[PDB]
Design a protein around this ligand. Sequence first.
Ligand SMILES: C[S@@+](CC[C@H](N)C(=O)[O-])C[C@H]1O[C@@H](n2cnc3c(N)ncnc32)[C@H](O)[C@@H]1O
Lengths: 1210, 108, 108
Amino acid sequence: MNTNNIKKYAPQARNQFRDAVIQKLTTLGISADKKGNLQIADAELVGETMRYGDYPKSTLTRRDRLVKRAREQGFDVLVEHCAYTWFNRLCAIRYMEIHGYLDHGFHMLSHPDNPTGFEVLDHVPEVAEALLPEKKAQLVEMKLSGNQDEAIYRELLLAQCHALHRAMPFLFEAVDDEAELLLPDNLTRTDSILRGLVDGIPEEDWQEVEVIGWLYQFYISEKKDAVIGKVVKSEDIPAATQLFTPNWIVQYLVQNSVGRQWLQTYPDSPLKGKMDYYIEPAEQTPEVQAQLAAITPASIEPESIKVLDPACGSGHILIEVYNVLKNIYEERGYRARDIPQLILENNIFGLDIDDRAAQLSGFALLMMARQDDRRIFTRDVRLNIVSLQESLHLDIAKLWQQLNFHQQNQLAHTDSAEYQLLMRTLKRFVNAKTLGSLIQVPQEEEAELKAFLEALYRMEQEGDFQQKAAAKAFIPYIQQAWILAQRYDAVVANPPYMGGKGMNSELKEFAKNNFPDSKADLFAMFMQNAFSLLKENGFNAQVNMQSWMFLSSYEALRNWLLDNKTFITMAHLGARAFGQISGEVVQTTAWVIKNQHSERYQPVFFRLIDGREEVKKSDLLLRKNIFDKFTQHDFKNIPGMPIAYWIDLPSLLSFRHHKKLGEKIALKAGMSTGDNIKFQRYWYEVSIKKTLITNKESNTKIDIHNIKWFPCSSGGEYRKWYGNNEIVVNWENNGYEIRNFKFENGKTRSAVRNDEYYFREGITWSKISQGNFCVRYRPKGFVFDDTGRCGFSNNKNELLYAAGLMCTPVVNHYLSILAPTLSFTSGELASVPYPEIEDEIIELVTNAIEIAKNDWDSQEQSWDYVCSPLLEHNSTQLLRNIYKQKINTNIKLVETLLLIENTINNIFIDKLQLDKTIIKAVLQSEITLLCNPNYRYKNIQDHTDLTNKYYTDITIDILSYIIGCMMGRYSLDREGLVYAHEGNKGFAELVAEDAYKTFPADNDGILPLMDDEWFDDDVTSRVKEFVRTVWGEEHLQENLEFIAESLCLYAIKPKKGESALDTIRRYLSTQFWKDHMKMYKKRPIYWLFSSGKEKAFECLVYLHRYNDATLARMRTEYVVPLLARYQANIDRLNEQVDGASGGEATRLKRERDSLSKKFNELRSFDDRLRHYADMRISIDLDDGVKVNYGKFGDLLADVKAITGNAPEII
Amino acid sequence: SNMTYNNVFDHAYEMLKENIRYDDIRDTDDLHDAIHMAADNAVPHYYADIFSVMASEGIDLEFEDSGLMPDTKDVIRILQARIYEQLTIDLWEDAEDLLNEYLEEVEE
Amino acid sequence: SNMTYNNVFDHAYEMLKENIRYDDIRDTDDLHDAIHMAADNAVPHYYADIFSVMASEGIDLEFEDSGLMPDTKDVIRILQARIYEQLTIDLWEDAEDLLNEYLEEVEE
Ligand SMILES: C[S@@+](CC[C@H](N)C(=O)[O-])C[C@H]1O[C@@H](n2cnc3c(N)ncnc32)[C@H](O)[C@@H]1O
């Protein structure tokens, strides 16, 4: 079947039918404002003609039963229902003329031998003879005028629907006067809505019945995507939760539920022969085997079994229950023609809130029974597939005396049990359109409700005009209530999926008051409520989202399940199970849970989480990937009690025998500052004197009054032993800013938690970690927030012993059981095993931590940074031979940590009595060191391109240090960080202390980053001065030529004959700013001022070394002296273009041209630096770098890449 | 030296999932920054890689908004700008989805 | 979809050999046009090819002269401009060689 014709048509057919009902309402006098507000206009009385906007007068009482319904229901609500219901009434006629189910047998909507005609037009008398016998001579005289074909086609189609009111009353009503008025006109035009129904759906698509389900799903498809994300209105629920389950899941469900009970009583029932999805009860213990046979009845009558889908939708599930009862009656020996009546009446019951999902459902089931019994259409066939109804609109007192039940008129009897039972039930269904089949009814009221429902049926046919219309309104409620009061042998359904942030105000409080253990999603509420609708030995079998199996928000429930109910069989599907959904928003699982408790019971599991829907259907029929080795009492041993069938044995038995990790290490969640952009900074954004970082060069006491920024373990990326020490927070006056930080109304905004554990030694991990899990060492002087949870012990050995564990794959083996997500919170991780303290691990961890501290501290982003790792070897060796020396060193360090990590893993594996096949050891590409090229470069797989990439970052790391030396941030004479605090204070006191006597620190802090040597304190000039100063004038050229080789590898592209020095100056003025952006995470400490995009003047400025008069000096001794050079050289270049001819005069022109555009830019950059320099702007380093970078408008570079906001020009 | 834009959008998309969680962004009126940074941090750095991204599907060579285009002699910045803009546009098209996904991720 | 700049300079270089012969250019004071056209006619037209040229040796991504750079939202024009400029610069570096080669090619 080509659903594409359907999928394209049904959503458009929804809107065709709606707009066709809206233009029939405008004449009916019913409309709404642009937003939605009803309107009427009494009605004009022209003798016996009512002109509303033009209609007979007898169509006025049937018009004012529609003005009724709108006031209480809504304009956008009635269109959607009535365009759905007529679209339903027609698709059922379209379906019944193709299967020739009409007694008159002529095509009713199309013409077999005419793609554009209608066959009932040609046989007007035949079609009328069957339907309108007395109106033939009048219909015969119309088609004999030849011009009223639209008026004739309408008289018949309605005469067909009144005819269908007897056997299918849920869809075709008779004195449904209100309906017949919304039937559109223009049914015989080339643009009638009808043509699309014949032309948009090939007749092949109409053969099977599931088409009903595809119509069902696709029709409502469009309104779904709008009602998502928001809260779903009570009227939009069916849209936001309507799917269509693959047939092979419904078969598993109905056959492992309905067929199971008939099998448990008559074991050799051949029924098993059809069910291919029937799972075989695992070898049960002969005790439970003996328990189950003492409960099963010795005999079940086929017509005593009673099944219930509380949310059928397309009835898609009921069709299967109908199929499996069909082979119970075929196996029991009942006449083929006698089966449909006995199933639909005795066995199948259905419910739903979508009045129209019940219309289609009952048709799909009646098209099932007509495919087997041609005369079912003649019998009085009551269907137990009703939609739930509200009761905020009933004329209660008019109907109880229109009933005349006790026959009082030839409120009497308010102490009679027919009034007391009547009023008790109308209150349970106050908000039924919103509560659905979740409103419970006691089984004690079954008999009373049923006995009164059949009496209401009685007086619907034996009463007069008053008792008949009256009881006809009452039955919808008493029936659905009796359905709910009845207890069933099995309840199957694909319940609706809707989270609490789509649930509405009425549904939330009902969830809190009736379903505490499963208030989360609707599918849990259905799973729990279905148990209260089952006989003792009844079965519950749904298909649900999988989260109820692992989330600790359901532990209350998973414990309720494991103790009172019994797991029979589950099929764990996972993602992409449904093949008409996009987005990883869906993962699923199916199951069957008996309503009896059997502790020792052994359930069978099927791990079908891989492949597309097609893959799992194959593997299920083929019984692949089975787990039948763990009872529901074994899942009680895993904390939280997660269904975790996929477990092994030794991992299950390690839980009963050891103490929990939490019992020994205090896992503590950090604070929540309330504002990460206000209170958190990178430790280099602010002063080093204003941070609680114990520097190696400040023996002057750390005034704990002056300290404003404290390092904060803020999670970060994957890292195994020490790193991620980058984030400092504002904890001045013990958090006087964060504690008192309230909202604008007074409700406190920040969440200072565990403020007692601050400044302590402990371990830290990334609470939010996409991949594996790992902790780190965290020395004294740290605070921590919520993104970086930290665990503390007092015993430093237990702290280290836990550290080495919490980085092993052994822990990521346990964290996959307790909860498969990305959240490594404090609940699941506390229940991890934790064996006795072995002392061999405590030393392997300390070797590990210091290797990972040494790797981290090797970067200029770590406060424990010392100096460039190149400065550790002999300065006489060639520099290109020193690179080879450091690559061979960094690879040995990786094997040292890898052998330390694997020995920690395999040791933990032996103590916990685990299996080494399951826990894979640590590979090389998993060592969390920055000197490990297989982890730092996950992208490049190659070897020559993986080598050159590493060569480039090392080249950059040593370049950012020579510039750091130039700015005064580091020194060859003094180890570690040197100058780094606000306003260039104290820099001069260090020059008189010979703090930089080896390599001089630049004069003003303005390093001209230009593409030609104009100044002597120019960056490139000083880099050459740096290599000559370190590795010798002897190797200056071999060392410098080698820096151009490594830069042109990946960083930039080569040029022919571009000298090694011009190669380094080119990287600097083009690519270095990029790499320093990347290197400090857009929070640079060397800011790049730019004249423009000619690069007429660019210079680096150390953030810390900035004061009011900095822009002044940049203009005095640079922007001014350079413009008198440009002029003195542009007049000397205009002497030279003239004196050249041939090819050389051309060569000199292009050089006067590139230099003149730099004189106008620097003239337009000076008038803007004359504006911001007269301002004497002074910065507060505490404000962060995002904030200060926008104060300067467009004097800086990438102001929007950094600040996010464009540069405010002036 | 290959690298696809779809690869790059995936990093950017993941950057923004983190950025929303690290700042507790709730309404779109405060989502702008988290989207801009996620894009900028995902742009490739090498000339070989940046060209590779352009040559791929999901990104064209005509900008939308001149202001985001550096009037500049540095074409790697330009091609680098064009990838920023494309990433931001696509990210906003999933903004309500994520704000819904992150709002709908606690349920507590 | 590969194409090297050295491939492109070869077409441009050959364009200029023809251009000098078809107009009888003798002094460099009249060579400017023939060089500009030869470069423009050699720029690739497809996005796939133009990126391929950039990624190759002999051409960088920073212009020399803003005027030749279309201040434009159309980056294929820009990358297309950058290849024009590089071609013209290289061609002038062989101008006297060709003017000598074409002057020295008749000998009659
Ligand atoms: C079961 S699904 C629809 C798809 C269906 N599985 C099928 O096979 O066609 C959800 C349906 O039941 C409705 N619903 C919501 N809450 C309900 C409740 N408490 N009882 C019954 N139906 C409910 C939804 O609005 C929707 O119409």
